[PDB]
Structures are given as C-alpha cells and as structure tokens.
Design an enzyme around this catalytic site. Structure first.
Site: not given
Ligand SMILES: CCc1ccccc1
Length: 163
Positions: A11, A20, A32, A117, A132
C-alpha cells in the site's frame, strides 16, 4: 515479515490525501476515505477518522493508527463472515496474512465472492487455487500485487516479499 509489513509494502505510505488504484480518495497506508468524487467529502471523512480538523494531511503516527484499526477490521470482518471464517481457520499463519491482505484491499463482501478460490484454498489445492485466483478483475487491475498475494497462497512462504 508479517501482515503489517506485507501491507505496508503493498500500500505504501502517503501523508496527504491521494487517489488509489481505482481513483478513490485515500490516505496513509491504503486507508480508503470515500468512493465519492468530492474531495470535500473525502476531507470530511478524514477529519472524522482522525478526530481533528486536518488540512488533508496527517502525521506518520496518525497513518499508523488508522492502519492498525484497518488491519484489525479486516480480521474482524473475516471472522464474522460465514464464508470466510472456515477458510481462514483452515490456513496456516502465512496464508492467513494473504487472506487479510485481500480483504484489506477489496473488502469482506468482495473476497467472499471468490467462492471457488476459497474452496480450493480450504482443500489445500494450492496451484489450482492460484490459477483460479488469477482469473479475476482483481488480478487484471493490480497484477503485480495480486501475483505477490497469490504466490503467498501458493507457497505459504514470504518469498514474494523478500529482496
Ligand atoms: C480468498 C482468500 C481468503 C481466504 C479466507 C478468508 C478470506 C480470504
């Protein structure tokens, strides 16, 4: 290596409001603020989060405080989610970090959508899960980060975060 260091790598750290990878106002270590296109709305969210009237700029300590809260929130969210919790419980500690990373990036609801997944991960079919996981908007939009996270799920090592 641990989840804090991992997410700090993925990040970055920025002390002023930035956008972002999706164009959304963010601050700190991937905190965020809002999906609103309004910078004023983002500033308001920032002030509320920090507890003071900022200038759109925070300190490193403030960024790290939000980061602590956000990692905790990601874990909490996994544990409260009926789809995510059993898979998380089934994983070793390194792969648990990969799971937290995904939830931090896309939220609990988003990760819970990786149904197939998740099943492969619980089955410990690591190469199949990795294939996947890559068949996703996530991988296409942030391929380098997704490759690191997927490698962590595939191997149960920190190899993608070393050097
Ligand atoms: C899809 C990775 C994952 C696994 C368990 C919990 C959350 C996320």
């Amino acid at each position: 290596m641990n989840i804090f260091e991992m997410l700090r790598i993925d990040e970055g750290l920025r002390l002023k409001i930035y956008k972002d990878t999706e164009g959304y106002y963010t601050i700190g270590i991937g905190h965020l603020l809002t999906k609103s296109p309004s910078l004023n709305a983002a500033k308001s969210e920032l002030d509320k989060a920090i507890g003071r009237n900022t200038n759109g700029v925070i300190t490193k300590d403030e960024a790290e405080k939000l980061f602590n809260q956000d990692v905790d929130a990601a874990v909490r969210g996994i544990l409260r989610n009926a789809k995510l919790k059993p898979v998380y419980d089934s994983l070793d500690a390194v792969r648990r970090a990969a799971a937290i990373n995904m939830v931090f990036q896309m939220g609990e609801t988003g990760v819970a959508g990786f149904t197939n997944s998740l099943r492969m991960l619980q089955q410990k079919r690591w190469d199949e899960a990795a294939v996947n996981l890559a068949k996703s908007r996530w991988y296409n939009q942030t391929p380098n980060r997704a490759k690191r996270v997927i490698t962590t799920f595939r191997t149960g090592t920190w190899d993608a975060y070393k050097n």
